[model samples]
Target: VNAVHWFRKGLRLHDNPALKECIQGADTIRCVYILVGINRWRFLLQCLEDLDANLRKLNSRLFVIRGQPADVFPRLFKEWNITKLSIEYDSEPFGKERDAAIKKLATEAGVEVIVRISHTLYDLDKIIELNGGQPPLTYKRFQTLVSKMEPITSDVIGKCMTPLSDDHDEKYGVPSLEELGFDTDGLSSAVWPGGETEALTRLERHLERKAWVANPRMNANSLLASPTGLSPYLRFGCLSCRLFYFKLTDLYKKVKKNSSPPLSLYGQLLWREFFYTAATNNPRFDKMEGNPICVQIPWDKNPEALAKWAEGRTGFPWIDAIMTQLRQEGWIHHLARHAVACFLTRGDLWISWEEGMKVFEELLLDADWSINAGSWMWLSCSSFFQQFFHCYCPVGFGRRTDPNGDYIRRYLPVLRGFPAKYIYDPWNAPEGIQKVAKCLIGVNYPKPMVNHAEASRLNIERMKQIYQQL
Candidate 1:
């Protein structure tokens, strides 16, 4: 069989059953990645380039093109003499429709459309099916479903595959950001380089780097405690999930320093699986209005407030700093995200989770509908959770983590000189104090956009009223 391993979110070669199994008896394998300009195209390009390099190690390479999968696969199926087609699978709703169209086209062409669910631990479809065709509404219910299954703990190697024969399109190869019609500015080649090499190295380095995966408040404030920045690697299939899991367990015992779920690295992976199940089970999981599980409140359509929040100009330095970090680096710490998300929805400004979720989808390198939307809903208290009284305080929440506001100063240079007393709340600085900081509150940095106290009180009342009606 002449096979074509289609690269979607699954980008790595190791523990990739689709890539590994399909290439069993192939004459040659032609790898391809489709660029559609839907999500951040730069990260996609990074993954493709990284994949091409790895294939070069094996005397093979990746082919990049621009089209929908259905359109590209049909043509490539005939052009590359592809008899078997292996697709990366998950239960994200958009992927389902897209795969169906491509499979239908492959069927007509008499090519075998093959796929395996390697992205998550359990197949999302099976989890949904276990819950009677709906996703488990709570984590306890989700755990009950998982307790009945065996853990997938094997760490497979990526070096057992056959090599390529005749490579095509070595001339018309990977395109630039401009060729893809995306702007060349802010293209990241460092900080978070994408590839399988970096992904596995990162996972290994983290296990060797630290013992205690301490909560974010201590000396573990930098990327060292960043839970193996290979999330992008996992997101793009540049790293093997099975290898990651087993290696993590092996290291956990070796470097035993007190760890558990919701905080440990394993817990973080479980969180990803949970969101996948929820997103798969509930179609309206992204929106508050149509989602039956979401409690509908009269969320104000405040575009101005939302734009400020997205642009990191809400005048709350902590929130602004984190928002700035997210846009520049394509990620924020979970606590920072919680603070800003709470402020945007039920804390300070009355914006919708949908609005915040859109910005996240565009900016986050690890953004998936299953994780991004599910997290936003969880933070907003709109669905998946309902602790209306517990809202993250913009003025003090970040201070608890970084007392001197190093994080705020790092992201917001204008507040770099503010007194430690006023770093988290620079508007409270007197006129002379603001002058000394070289950033006037109303000038380079605006004043607090809204009184958090007033906003929080109003939101609590509105939420209580809505809950009562329900």
Candidate 2:
């Protein structure tokens, strides 16, 4: 039998049961990948290249398809004489829509379709089912339900995976950034490399450190830096969730003889699961109006303010620095994310969370549809979390996290001349102090976009009014 396994988000070889299934009893097998925008996700291009390199060892290569799947798959099914088609289950609404279309086409072509749940730890459908066909909206409720469910096991793929014979006529190869219309002239090298190889390396190092310490603690400084920068790797399926879960447990066991690990450690993984479960059944989970659970508030329509925030032109040094880091590095600390997300939405600007979500979708390497939207909604007080009055102050939050203001200075060099006293609130510095720093608040960088004290107070009342209306 000839088989075709389509690669979606689950790009790794390990813990990929669907890919393993595609290899079984097949004389010929082909792997196909669909391309997304290169500029938005440069790391994705590196991931594709790494996947191709790994596939080469198995005597196969990835076929980078650059067109609509509707038009692309029909031709492949015919030309390859494909008997079986396999793929990872996509839980997002748009992804489900596309997969449904592809499955219908495969059926018409008389192809047997196989889909597996590997991207997430548990079947999102089963999670929804257990919650009485409605997804749990709160993290505690979700976690409580999840405790009753058993953990999903990882898959192995060493000897069972047979090498496919190389096809000389196949011309499909991974495309370069320039080839994909990306201007790569002055682009910086990746701070975080992509692929399963890099994913396992980083995981091993983190575990080794954890085992060595026997007790790992995170401080306020840890907000600016991740203990383990595996989020992006996990997002791309460069690392498998199940594999990560087991490895984490194994490390914990080595450190603590019989005692169980802390909740905060596994809490990070469950946080991801919580969002996925919340968003899976709700098609309009990303929007404000149609989304059943989301609170509908009339957000301000000011493209000017949005542009300022997106380009890091906001005079709030803390917010601008975080945004700058996201644009340049494709990642920010999770607390940094909450700070910026709050500033963009209910905290000061009163813009919709959807707007902020789209920005993160383009820039954040770990940006997944479910987690991003759910976090935006929670941070913006649109859904899940209702404590809108408790807001993150742009100046105070950063100053507390980084007493020296080094993080702000690192991303926003124009504000670097200011002393630690005026770093977070440069505008508040005396006129002589501004001259000493060689950076005028209004003229050099920017004036504070909105008066935080007045704006947040006003926004909080507005949120109170909206919730009262609901």
Candidate 3:
């Protein structure tokens, strides 16, 4: 077989059945990879460079194809004499469309297509099928549904031993961020360097930290702080979810002896799977209007308000700070996302979740399409939840997590000088205090964008009216 292992999302060689199985008994093999743009440019380049380097050690090179799969793969199938087109199964609706097109082209061109499910822990389609053609709506319900199935981990390996000659061209080589047309001005060094090597290293280090600690309860908050920052690695498939899940269980058994692992630890991974299952069949999974599950509400189309929220100028210190962090770092704490998301939709801004989802798609490195859209909908009470009244209070929520307002200050340095009492609600600080802090509410920092109390009250009433009509 002459194989082409298409790197869809699974960037790593380890635990990649799709890559290994594709090359079995192959006479020739070529590896190819692809991505998003701008803030994610550095991370994408790093992952590709690392993947390219890894392939080189195996007597191969990664060919970077720069176009839609529809355009690129057909040409490659002919040029490289590819007998099989191999890819890790992508369950996202958009990914499925592209894959379907490519598969059609491959079939017509007499090329066999092999897709193995490795991006998720279990087959998303299988889950939906088991649930009678509908994905379970609640996490608890999803957990219960999956509990009956046996845990899956791919054991296939060492099949990528087929040797290849180095006839690679410069055009197939990995391009630098600058070459990708990114404006590199003030682009900070990567906080989380992307790649399987880094992913494995971080996993090992964090697990070791977990193993030594007597009380595993405290580790919960530590994970919550940035959720071990393993999400991007997982999102890019730099780290395998099955590997993470199994390693986690092994550690739990070693530490607790008789006890099973806590739901909080493993639940996060399942959350990703849950969203994948929901998003697999539905083409409108990311949108509200046409999505079968999403509740339709008369969401206001306010670009000015949307821009303010996206640019971190919403006047709410907590919301602004989180948005700023997301823009600069390409990541934010999950809870921070919930707060800002709530503020944007049902909490204060009265904006649409789709608007927020678009911003996250651009800015968040770990923003998986299914998960990001699902989360936005969840936070906004647009779907998968009905507790519109139990909204996140912008000032109170951030204050509850970081009592000293350190997180707000770190991201929104203009509020750095305000006292802990006034940090989250700087507009409420007395004139003397504001002058002393050297950050005027309306001047240095904008006033609280919308009055939280008034806005949230009205929004809750609006949500109630909408729900009653439904």
Colliding residue pairs in candidate 1: 11-236, 11-237, 12-237
Give the runs in model 3 whose Cα sits over 4 Å from its true position. 35-37, 151-169, 214-227
lDDT of 2: 0.82
What does candidate 3's lDDT look like per residue over 1-470, in tens digits?
A: 67888897898988888777787877777778854546677887788889888777666778887888888877878877778978999999899998999999999889988899999989777777788889998878788888877562332333554344455546778888888877788777777788887888888877887788443331214313343468899999999998999898888898878676677778779999988888888889889988989999888999999999999998888889889878888887777888899999998989999999999999899887899889888889888875787779998888887778887788888888999999989888999999988899889988777889999999989999986565
Give residue 243's error in model 3 in angstroms: 0.3
How well does candidate 1 match the true structure, expressed as C-alpha RMSD? 3.5
User: Taking the candidates one at a time, how many backbone clashes does each contain?
Assistant: 3, 0, 0
Candidate 1 — worst ten consecutive residues by lDDT sum? 152-161
Q: How accurate is candidate 3 locally (lDDT)?
A: 0.82
lDDT accuracy of residue 307 in candidate 1? 93
Q: RMSD of candidate 2 to the true fold?
A: 2.7
| Model 1, span 1-470: residue lDDT tens | 67888888788777777876777767777777876322356667777787787776666777777777766777778877778888778678777777888888888988887798888877877887778988887776777787666462322223333344454445436776787777757454545766777787788777666555432334417512264676767767777676777777767656665444333456667778888888864667788877877878677898988999999999998899888888877767777778889999888787888999999988877778888998888888887765887778898887887888888888899899998899999988898999999999888899888988888888878877776564
